[PDB]
Scaffold this active site. Structure first.
Site, mmCIF file in Angstrom:
data_model
loop_
_atom_site.group_PDB
_atom_site.id
_atom_site.type_symbol
_atom_site.label_atom_id
_atom_site.label_comp_id
_atom_site.label_asym_id
_atom_site.label_seq_id
_atom_site.Cartn_x
_atom_site.Cartn_y
_atom_site.Cartn_z
ATOM 1 N N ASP A 257 43.824 -1.622 32.535
ATOM 2 C CA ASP A 257 44.715 -2.873 31.253
ATOM 3 C C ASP A 257 44.627 -2.109 30.303
ATOM 4 O OD1 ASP A 257 45.121 -4.867 32.979
ATOM 5 O OD2 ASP A 257 43.610 -5.846 32.143
ATOM 6 N N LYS B 266 44.049 8.984 10.559
ATOM 7 C CA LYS B 266 44.236 11.025 10.484
ATOM 8 C C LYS B 266 45.529 11.002 9.109
ATOM 9 C CE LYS B 266 42.991 15.456 12.003
ATOM 10 N NZ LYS B 266 43.365 14.426 13.509
ATOM 11 N N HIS C 48 33.553 4.855 12.708
ATOM 12 C CA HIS C 48 34.668 4.950 11.983
ATOM 13 C C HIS C 48 33.988 5.269 10.533
ATOM 14 C CE1 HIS C 48 38.389 4.902 10.231
ATOM 15 N NE2 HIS C 48 38.257 3.822 10.167
ATOM 16 N N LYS D 58 43.314 -4.072 6.736
ATOM 17 C CA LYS D 58 43.002 -3.052 5.786
ATOM 18 C C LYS D 58 42.587 -1.961 5.790
ATOM 19 C CE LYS D 58 42.048 -4.844 1.252
ATOM 20 N NZ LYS D 58 44.491 -5.307 1.277
ATOM 21 N N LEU E 297 49.646 7.364 -6.038
ATOM 22 C CA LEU E 297 49.553 8.740 -5.994
ATOM 23 C C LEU E 297 49.531 9.905 -4.912
ATOM 24 C CD1 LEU E 297 45.781 9.463 -7.250
ATOM 25 C CD2 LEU E 297 47.682 8.517 -8.839
ATOM 26 N N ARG F 215 37.162 -13.868 4.376
ATOM 27 C CA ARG F 215 36.434 -11.926 3.184
ATOM 28 C C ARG F 215 35.585 -11.755 3.962
ATOM 29 N NH1 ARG F 215 35.147 -9.912 -0.605
ATOM 30 N NH2 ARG F 215 36.981 -8.164 -0.050
#
Lengths: 469, 469
Positions: free
Chosen positions: A16, A179, A237, A340, A396, A452
């Site tokens: 799968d 990345k 991570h 997020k 930025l 949250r």
């Protein structure tokens, strides 16, 4: 890596995971030719299937178009399938023979992909090292998370894989890693004297590392219970984020140098008990939806009375001169309010307030996903006939993250893949936590689906010193 | 200051300066009602005129419309004119009687404006102190540049003005000052730990203070000669920029504290020799279309064989612990390539270059005019498959400057006006150089009308350490 032939061996072609994410990813990479031109795909699984069956069961997730049906049928012109068991040298030799019966299969850089069940990693890797090694080109291996459950199991697995392959051949992948601006944070951090020297204990107050998801664990609930959020995303991570944020000056910015700085930071992390850990788990959303109407414990595949957490908030520290005494935050979860992935670097207030306590702690967000954006929420004067300043969000700042990571695997860049010794030290950090988990089975605090997260995490950042507007 | 009556005494109402810049400015401020509601204007001059004559001679420059003709006639409904000489107590008493014969003229805060010729400042200020003082409200004056010629003359004039009025009743105005982008520099400097702690010798490499003007001095060439660019713009406006940039630990943003830190910085700079000087003067353009066809020496009103400079580049190095050994650059001029007023805070390169010398020295531009904007030309990675950064201009960012400075004079804010002691110290550090200038009559290097200025200024920036890319 655009001339020599490559083989992307997808062990578990009937799997799968393959059919849902890997084959469509290589289709995305092949319609645009991001993989090398002479790229072969050789699946492998227990069930006896064919290329036509693969097409029939994988076309809907490929979601191709009649405009490029020709490109699609060229995409399956490079495909193949091999049938065999996962622990039998006979079928492994058959797989090796099929690989060699191609356009320089022996010369081909066999880039193995382990998408097969986690319980067999040891045996599959042993057989791969014993039989499926090409002695011409590099034979990288992609091992999917997780890499054991506690310190001892992870150490045994890492030692076995190290005795088989070297770290130049082991590729520990992390899907969630962006990345894209995990790479841009590095440039922002290194190529500036604006952010350079204030990247120390006195100036940066804390670092918030967040990774939320909008969807729960529908269907595949039987894979998360044995593992937990800490071993799934929090230890891989979020530690990748923490290391790439806290790393010292690499001085050569290469993969080995950055991973060595990661190892140095991690070795500069002391033991963590439950005192810097918070756990949470979600339940049914009262304002239900097509999938929100049922919680984690409502999934029939989840064993009853399971204390596996899907929310983990921990605080780390680095005991070296650059980062001495300064805190770092880890936050993640599943089924949260909104997708997020951000790294909020909240700086210290300037010593001596003169704008009458209007100075807000300067921030720097790196929103990895969705809608990738980096912005500094610095504070400047508002136009008009005034003098007081206003906090303003100053922005930025393209293949998807997973196909970019596979391309990096093809290129050989091991910047964003955890090392064996890095993983060893990372497990050493949380050995007391993991032993307590497996000993007492702690009960995480319930939280609402699509909220949250548990309030104890925000209280944890507040205890650290993080200021919330 | 919206209830008590005010008077804006424009001494020299028939004067060209008044009719060209002051009356249109107060008209701009009055059509929108930025002066107090009960404001009066009482001009004064040697030549005998009337309100109707003032209307006839000053209407065309107001660039108004018949829609606002009603507002314009209301604006002249409060105007007035008094006739008399500049050095006669009889006419001064007539002026005072005219003031008292108004709607609470004695209670009105007489905001004198010395727009009258520079040669009479001593006598006019003495007479104003002797007779034209109201003892009810504040009585500020606006003293126009230049404030003496050399150290001794400046000291005598400033001491006389100090004996007449306290420093609360003196406003050394500078028209060119923006009052807006300078105001935002203060905030950007104080409310950030991004720029705060690195506002020191080790991080900020240098500071460039620039002020250019596309138009020369056509017609009024007989005014600039006796003064020089240094005493016109450099010693007032560029030193104001330097003080705002350099001042150490300002404390409360109030005028007293900011001006005290200006005094401290200027006491922390030693004497300027000839070795930190570049001078330039402009000539006509063969390819010019308008005024460019004639240079500064082509003006009939300019005395022949005049060595007055219109370009001056002098670097300062403030000698105190926060700023020990740093370059601070001053560039200015008239008839340059294009209008600008910027402060380029070039920072140091990060110790240890890892992007293979792709690191460009981080900047921070503060364009005061035209089109006010702050942009940090920091360097970030451009999207792509390469780990490489790009130097990107990142923007950070309503009457005009003269209107806002007149409003500041009305409000009482003396942060933008140079102090008596600050002026004394600036003249003290320029005394050896200025005396040598008046002694030997140095010849500035010629440069082209509408060019970027003499190359020796860029040589000076390179010598102090400024990097041009």
């Amino acid at each position: 890596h655009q001339s020599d032939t490559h083989i992307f061996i997808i062990m578990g072609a009937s799997g799968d995971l393959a059919k849902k994410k890997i084959y469509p990813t290589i289709w995305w990479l092949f319609r645009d030719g991001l993989l090398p031109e002479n790229t072969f795909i050789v699946g492998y699984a227990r069930s006896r299937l064919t290329v036509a069956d693969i097409r029939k069961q994988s076309e809907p997730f490929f979601k191709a178009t009649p405009e490029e049906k020709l490109k699609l049928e060229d995409f399956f012109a490079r495909n193949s399938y091999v049938a065999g068991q996962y622990d039998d040298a006979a079928s492994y030799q058959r797989l090796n023979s099929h690989m060699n019966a191609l356009h320089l299969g022996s010369q081909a850089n066999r880039l193995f992909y382990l998408a097969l069940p986690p319980t067999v990693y040891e045996a599959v890797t042993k057989n791969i090292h014993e039989s499926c090694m090409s002695q011409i080109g590099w034979n990288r291996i992609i091992v999917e998370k997780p890499f054991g459950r506690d310190l001892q199991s992870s150490d045994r697995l890492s030692n076995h894989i190290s005795s088989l392959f070297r770290e130049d051949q082991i590729y520990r992948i992390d899907h969630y890693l962006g990345k894209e601006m995990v790479q841009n944070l590095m440039v922002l951090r290194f190529a500036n004297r604006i952010f350079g020297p204030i990247w120390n204990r006195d100036n940066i107050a804390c670092v918030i590392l967040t990774f939320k998801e909008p969807f729960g664990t529908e269907g595949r609930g039987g894979y998360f219970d044995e593992f937990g959020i800490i071993r799934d995303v929090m230890q891989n991570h979020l530690l990748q984020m923490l290391c790439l944020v806290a790393m010292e000056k690499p001085a050569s910015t290469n993969s080995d140098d950055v991973r060595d700085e990661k190892v140095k930071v991690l070795k500069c992390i002391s033991e963590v008990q439950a005192n810097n850990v918070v756990l949470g788990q979600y339940v049914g959303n009262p304002d239900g939806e097509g999938e929100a109407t049922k919680g984690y414990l409502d999934d029939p595949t989840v064993p009853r009375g399971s204390t596996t957490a899907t929310f983990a908030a921990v605080v780390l520290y680095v005991e070296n001169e650059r980062w001495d005494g300064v805190p770092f935050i880890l936050r993640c979860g599943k089924a949260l309010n909104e997708r997020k992935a951000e790294v909020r670097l909240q700086f210290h207030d300037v010593a001596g307030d003169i704008f009458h306590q209007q100075c807000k702690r300067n921030e720097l967000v790196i929103r990895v996903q969705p809608n990738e954006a980096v912005y500094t929420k610095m504070m400047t004067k508002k136009p008009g006939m005034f003098f007081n300043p206003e906090e303003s969000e100053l922005d930025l700042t393209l293949p998807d993250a997973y196909e970019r990571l596979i391309l990096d695997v093809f290129c050989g860049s091991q910047m964003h893949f955890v090392r064996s010794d890095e993983l060893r030290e990372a497990w050493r950090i949380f050995t007391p936590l993991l032993h307590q988990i497996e000993l007492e089975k702690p009960k995480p605090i319930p939280y609402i689906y699509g909220s949250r997260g548990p309030t104890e995490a925000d209280e944890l950042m507040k205890r650290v010193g993080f200021q919330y507007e």
